[PDB]
Design a protein around this ligand. Structure first.
Ligand SMILES: [Zn+2]
Ligand SMILES: [Zn+2]
Ligand SMILES: [Zn+2]
Ligand SMILES: [Zn+2]
Lengths: 47, 153, 66, 284, 460, 351
């Protein structure tokens, strides 16, 4: 039911979690919107 | 000396005790006022040093900005120190390293701008707040450079 | 070091006025009247102030307790 | 707030001779004994008549001194009784000395001393439920040579530490001897919120004592007087003997081993390891 | 409480040193000082050299400086020390007589006074004459309070009570009733009572043949420890011997019969300083005999009893019919209004109940206690450890009879700018010391803690 | 008349590392009136006590808390190694009141999901404080139990005043068959000791499993005070520790380094472990008339030995409960204290 690649590709789930925490969405965007990290590995930490 | 002289000295002391003595008046008190003073010196020195342990930044907006920078660099280094340990995704490590070097230069420019604008005391406080993370990322960069040289040479 | 000692009294302004009346009746022992809610007095005569206050309240109210 | 200061003075006639050997023989333990008596009296006076206790550690066992187990069956004069009784007992103990006493030099019963003293503290606290006793013990050791660091007592010392912390009993230690920081004792005082004092030999401690060994009863707003840093870079490798920093600790054995794994059967518990796990470790 | 320590510092410095000549007196007064001063004195006693004050400041840290001032002010007031503006600095050192006497006492000094005791066949039994001393104390307590029959023959004691105005009783008519002094006597349980009596004997016995140094020597030698042998025979001044006989009459000396022997060390002198257990024809067993009654229903339930104790209880509650274990009594606003007629404040009685009548309220105070102090931060509601309901009812009766509000402190000024006044007010609100303030007048009447901390910050 | 354990017969192995996931029970059943406030309040209080105790004795493990309300398992504390978080979580819960029916199945599945990250050398566990007499499952249960035992996840449950067949099956199933772990209570004190015995690691007779060396390093305290700076919570903290390898500050803990992710400990945790591994032989109670030993204590000095011929009093017993290997006496208080708090046997230390 839960797999590393599954959570990796669960884009809608990931964006929902982005909505989950202001701190989360903030750090994510500044790791992304700042021309930083592809979301894939960013979640690969946060699985 | 052991055994013989051991028992000898032991008996000597035993006697001395039994030899009335134990003049608690003669119990040092402090004897040499100088020795006393020296002891006090040692102790006040240690009290001072351990007291130095007082168990508040200026620019709240720059403080928060620096905090964001720290969080950013922290997670970036997090990903490297994951990858640089673990291992065949070498190109991913390369991208991470290039990004980390970019981040290091970015923070260097950040410090430059802080020194320019906030002056020195505020810049000093910022440098103090960022010293540990800065050292860690610099060490990570150096370690990667060493490993890359080792692999190449 | 400035510290002006005395019997500080604080109450409602009406009781303050009554206390000032009584105190004037007993030769004005109140050292100072800090404001409408505070009074500075000498503690020497505050006890007889309370005594005469009790006397006059007993005279007036008399506690019918009906 | 009464306090139960339970000194623990160890007296090795071997170490006593070492003290005579150290520097000159310009005075035996007699200095220490007298200073201890005076300090004990001082504490006995300071508070509202709070008891004390003293234990020793001679070459072939330990034995109480002050509380004076049933034997028959000046100045406030209770000072008098305490001190004269202690000295009578200690002279009796010194009679307990001979070659057979010289024989069992293998061990050093300090750990037994600390453990028993802690048991005593528990006894007294438990019996005296009313007026809870903010107790705390002490340690006096004549630092001798011939053993840079005896370790066969390492564990019981730490068990003493944990008992102390649970019982909330600071334990202060005074080592008199060579410039060898008694590492286990150092960690003991530091962890259990104590104070360490590595005096030189012949000075009349009484000042050192009454200064830095009298602030632990029930105060603790006051900066302790401990020496330089108390690094917790703990035990050297069981196999090697060199102090470890990035340890390598096996398993259910728990022994700390160096960067040199023997490859199998960690040399304190017979437990062969997964050679796959060995290679995983070797992947560096 | 007259706080005999205050009387101690009252006496001039030279006679203070006169007293300090007696090492045992030095020790006994060492017992009394606040712990901070105790520790500082014990530090200074040995290093034979004055010490700058800066060290004694830096010895203490934050949130505990209040005691520093307490100690220094006390010690200076009784002048045990000598502050020394030697180089414009502060070269503290004790009254050297004090230092030497104390040091002698710690290591076998020449205090023949403190060593006045004699060791011999102490045939005194624990109950032996201890019951007699307790009976004498009870008899004098009853006679002063006024019992149905007052066998108190202490003609000197009666004169002390009357001239001292011990109790609001008509001694001219022979009355021994409770006045404000009588109320306090009803209040101070043991140490308070003994202390008030000793002070009264001091004030009355102050005219001729005093030898105050010998007086305090005898008093403290009594309180120190059991002198026993040769005390009354040998270890006493002439006027010292007279004072000893008088005290033995007053109970405070348990001297044996035969009118000539060693000192009879009754437990009472121990009780003078101990601040400890209070329990004293040939029968009397009670660690909790006193069976008082005090719950949330404001009633008097008594099983355990003591006739003088229950009479004390009746001093603020009605009596109708004495029962076997009980006495007919119910505590109401009228019951305490009885003592309010004597003007007795509902203050001493608070701690009295918290302490006395507990021999029957042990379990009551335990269930109210519940150890609800460590549990207080977690469970924010107290388990009626000290009953607040009863306190509120008592305050209500007190308020019903009073109607006046007063505040302690001193008026303050020289708040030149609004900034200093506002910052001090904010700091006081942080520390909760400002009773009231106003920037318009730049004045207020509160405790000196804010000024003390600001002055210390400014100067050092 | 004695109540003693005869002998310990697994003094060779325990699970020293742990990851225990306590799951409470907050459901309508827990609101009956059998325990003084209720079931629920007393339960949570003892749960707090157990949290403190367990994180003391096993100071290297983690823990997570799970409730069962309205047939749902709502995680109330992530699996974490800091006792204070869990303590606070329980504080919060205790002011909230139960509802719905206990969905044992959901809680089980949530746990099994939760303990996946726990590595092989670490050991898993669950502790169901089951209070009700029913469940309400949205799926097959034996499916879950089979998945569990497939994932090597021992489970111990503490039922309230009854025995439920499925729970008995559950405990018997995961714990390698050997049924001893479904202990249910009959008194509050029994409950206290229940949690207490839940604190210790858990042996039965371990199958020969993989035993693995684990990398970890110890920190060194820091010195400066004003330089307050933290790398595990990103605050200013007046001084902490240094990872020997990651080399970044970490607020006080036995936690895992938040930079290079290796376990951090001092040693005293390892000392606690040592205490649990190899305990003492249970002290023997000396024969009443056959002792003829010293009339005192040994570790302490108590005067509670005998009375010497007193009809029934001396006929009772001789308080001389004496340990074996050192063969020295010890009064009852001393023996209780040794075997409870400090495990260095006094005499057996000295020889
Ligand atoms: Zn942190
Ligand atoms: Zn690290
Ligand atoms: Zn014992
Ligand atoms: Zn043993």
């Amino acid at each position: 039911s839960l797999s590393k690649e599954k959570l990796l590709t669960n884009l809608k789930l990931q964006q929902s979690l982005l909505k989950g925490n202001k701190v989360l969405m903030k750090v994510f965007q500044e790791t992304v919107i700042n021309a930083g990290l592809p979301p894939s590995e960013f979640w690969s930490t946060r699985i | 000396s052991n055994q013989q002289m051991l028992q000898q000295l032991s008996l000597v002391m035993d006697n001395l005790i039994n030899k009335l003595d134990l003049n608690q008046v003669v119990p040092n008190n402090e004897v040499s006022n100088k020795i006393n003073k020296r002891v006090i010196t040692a102790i006040k020195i240690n009290a001072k040093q351990a007291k130095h342990n007082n168990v508040e930044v200026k620019s709240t907006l720059p403080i928060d900005l620096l905090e964001s920078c720290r969080m950013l660099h922290t997670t970036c280094c997090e990903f490297l120190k994951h990858f640089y340990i673990h291992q065949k995704q070498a190109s991913t490590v390369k991208k991470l390293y290039n990004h980390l070097k970019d981040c290091i230069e970015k923070l260097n420019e950040l410090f430059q701008d802080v020194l320019n604008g906030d002056g020195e005391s505020m810049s000093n406080t910022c440098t103090a707040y960022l010293k540990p993370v800065l050292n860690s990322i610099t060490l990570a960069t150096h370690k990667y450079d060493e490993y890359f040289n080792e692999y190449n040479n | 070091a400035r510290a002006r000692k005395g019997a500080l009294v604080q109450c409602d302004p009406s009781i303050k006025a009554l206390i000032l009346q009584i105190d004037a009746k007993m030769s004005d022992i109140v050292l100072e009247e800090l404001d409408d809610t505070h009074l500075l007095v000498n503690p020497s005569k505050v006890e007889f102030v309370k005594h005469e206050l009790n006397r006059l309240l007993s005279k007036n109210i008399y506690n019918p307790m009906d | 707030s009464p306090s139960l200061l339970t000194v623990i003075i160890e007296i090795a006639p071997k170490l006593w001779t070492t003290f005579d050997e150290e520097g000159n023989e310009k005075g035996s333990i007699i200095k220490v004994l007298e200073a201890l008596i005076v300090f004990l009296n001082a504490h006995l006076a300071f508070n509202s008549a709070n008891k004390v206790a003293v234990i020793a550690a001679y070459s072939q066992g330990i034995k109480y001194l002050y509380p004076e187990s049933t034997s028959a069956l000046d100045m406030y004069r209770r000072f008098r009784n305490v001190d004269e009784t202690l000295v009578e007992e200690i002279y009796k103990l010194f009679e307990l000395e001979k070659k057979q006493i010289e024989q069992n030099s293998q061990r050093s019963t300090l750990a037994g001393a600390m453990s028993a003293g802690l048991t005593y503290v528990n006894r007294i606290s438990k019996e005296s439920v009313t007026t809870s006793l903010k107790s705390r013990l002490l340690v006096l050791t004549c630092g001798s040579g011939s053993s840079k660091d005896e370790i066969f007592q390492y564990i019981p010392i730490m068990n003493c530490i944990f008992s102390a912390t649970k019982m909330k009993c600071p334990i202060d230690v005074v080592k008199i001897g060579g410039s060898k920081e008694s590492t286990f004792l150092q960690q003991t005082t530091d962890a259990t919120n104590g104070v360490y004092l590595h005096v030189e030999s012949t000075e009349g401690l009484i000042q050192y004592l009454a200064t830095a060994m009298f602030i632990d009863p029930s105060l603790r707003p006051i900066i302790v007087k401990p020496n330089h840093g108390s690094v917790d870079f703990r035990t050297s490798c069981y196999l090697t003997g060199r102090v470890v920093a990035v340890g390598f600790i096996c398993s259910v054995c728990l022994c700390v081993l160096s960067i040199i794994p023997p490859g199998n059967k960690c040399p304190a518990c017979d437990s062969q390891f997964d050679e796959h796990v060995i290679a995983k470790l070797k992947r560096k | 409480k007259h706080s005999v320590t205050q009387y101690l510092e009252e006496i001039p410095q030279q006679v203070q040193n006169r007293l300090y000549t007696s090492p045992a007196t030095c020790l006994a007064i060492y017992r009394i000082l606040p712990p901070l001063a105790k520790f500082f004195i014990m530090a200074m006693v040995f290093n034979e050299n004055e010490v700058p004050l800066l060290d004694l400041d830096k010895w203490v840290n934050s949130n505990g400086k209040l005691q520093f001032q307490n100690a220094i002010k006390s010690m200076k007031s009784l002048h045990l020390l000598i502050p020394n503006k030697s180089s414009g600095t502060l070269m503290i050192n004790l009254n050297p007589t004090f230092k030497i006497s104390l040091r002698n006492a710690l290591t076998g000094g020449e205090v023949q006074n403190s060593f006045g005791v004699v060791v011999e066949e102490n045939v005194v039994s624990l109950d032996l004459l201890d019951e007699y001393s307790a009976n004498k104390w009870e008899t004098i307590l009853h006679f002063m309070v006024g019992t149905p029959l007052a066998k108190i023959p202490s003609e000197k004691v009666l004169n002390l009570l009357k001239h001292s105005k011990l109790m609001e009783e008509v001694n001219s008519t022979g009355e021994f009733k409770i006045t404000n002094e009588g109320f306090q006597f009803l209040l101070q349980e043991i140490n308070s009572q003994l202390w008030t009596l000793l002070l009264q004997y001091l004030k009355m016995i102050e005219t001729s043949k005093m030898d105050l140094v010998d007086v305090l020597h005898f008093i403290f030698m009594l309180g120190a420890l059991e002198v026993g042998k040769a005390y009354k025979i040998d270890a006493l001044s002439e006027t010292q011997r007279i004072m000893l006989q008088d005290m033995r009459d007053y109970g405070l000396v348990f001297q044996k019969h035969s009118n000539d022997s060693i000192f009879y060390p009754t437990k009472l002198a121990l009780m003078l300083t101990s601040d400890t257990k209070t329990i004293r024809g040939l029968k009397n067993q009670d660690i909790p005999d006193g069976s008082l009654i005090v719950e949330t229903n404001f009633k008097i339930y008594s099983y355990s009893n003591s006739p003088l104790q229950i009479a004390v209880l009746s001093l603020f509650v009605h009596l109708k019919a004495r029962f076997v274990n009980m006495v007919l009594g119910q505590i109401t606003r009228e019951s305490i209004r009885r003592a309010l007629t004597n003007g007795i404040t509902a203050d001493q009685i608070i701690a009295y109940l918290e302490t006395h009548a507990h021999p029957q309220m042990r379990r009551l105070a335990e269930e109210k206690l519940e150890k609800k102090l460590e549990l207080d931060p977690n469970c924010k509601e107290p388990l009626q450890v000290l009953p607040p309901t009863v306190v509120d009812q008592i305050r209500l009766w007190q308020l019903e009879l009073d109607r006046v509000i007063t505040y302690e402190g001193s008026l303050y000024s020289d708040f030149e700018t609004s900034q200093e006044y506002n910052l001090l007010s904010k700091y006081a609100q942080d520390i909760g010391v400002l009773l009231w303030k106003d920037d318009k007048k730049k004045k207020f009447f509160i405790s000196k803690e804010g000024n003390s901390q600001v002055l210390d910050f400014a100067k050092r | 008349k004695k109540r003693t354990a005869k002998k310990n017969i697994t003094p060779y192995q325990r699970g020293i590392i742990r990851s225990l996931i306590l799951t409470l029970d907050c459901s309508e059943a827990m609101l009956e009136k059998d325990l003084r406030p209720n079931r629920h309040a007393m339960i949570i209080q003892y749960a707090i006590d157990f949290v403190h105790e367990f994180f003391d004795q096993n100071p290297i493990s983690q823990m997570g808390i799970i409730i069962m309300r309205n047939g749902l398992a709502q995680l109330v504390s992530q699996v974490s190694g800091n006792p204070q978080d869990h303590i606070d979580a329980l504080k919060s819960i205790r002011k909230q009141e139960p509802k719905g029916n206990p969905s044992l199945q959901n809680a089980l599945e949530m746990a099994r999901g939760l303990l996946l990250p726990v590595p092989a050398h670490c050991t898993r566990e669950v502790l169901i404080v089951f209070g009700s007499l029913s469940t309400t499952d949205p799926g097959d249960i034996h499916q879950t139990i089979d998945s569990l035992v497939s994932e090597k996840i021992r489970v111990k449950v503490l039922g309230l005043s009854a025995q439920v067949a499925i729970c008995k099956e559950l405990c018997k199933a995961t714990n390698y068959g050997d049924e001893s772990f479904y202990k249910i209570l009959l008194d509050e004190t029994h409950l206290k000791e229940l949690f207490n015995e839940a604190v210790t690691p858990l042996p039965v007779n371990k199958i020969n499993k993989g035993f693995t060396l684990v990398k970890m390093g110890f920190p060194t305290r820091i010195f400066e005070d004003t330089p307050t700076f933290c790398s595990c919570h990103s605050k200013l903290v007046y001084g902490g520790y240094f990872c020997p390898n990651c080399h970044s500050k970490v607020c006080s803990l036995p936690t895992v380094c938040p930079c290079c992710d290796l376990m951090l400990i001092l040693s005293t945790h390892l000392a606690r472990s040592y205490h649990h591994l190899m305990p003492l032989k249970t002290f023997a109670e000396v024969p009443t008339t056959e002792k003829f030993r010293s009339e005192d204590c040994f570790s302490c000095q108590s005067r509670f030995p005998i009375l010497k011929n007193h009809k029934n009093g001396k006929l009772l017993t001789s308080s001389r409960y004496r340990c074996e290997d050192c063969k020295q006496e010890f009064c009852v208080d001393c023996d209780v204290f040794i075997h409870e708090i400090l495990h260095n046997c006094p005499g057996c230390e000295s020889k």
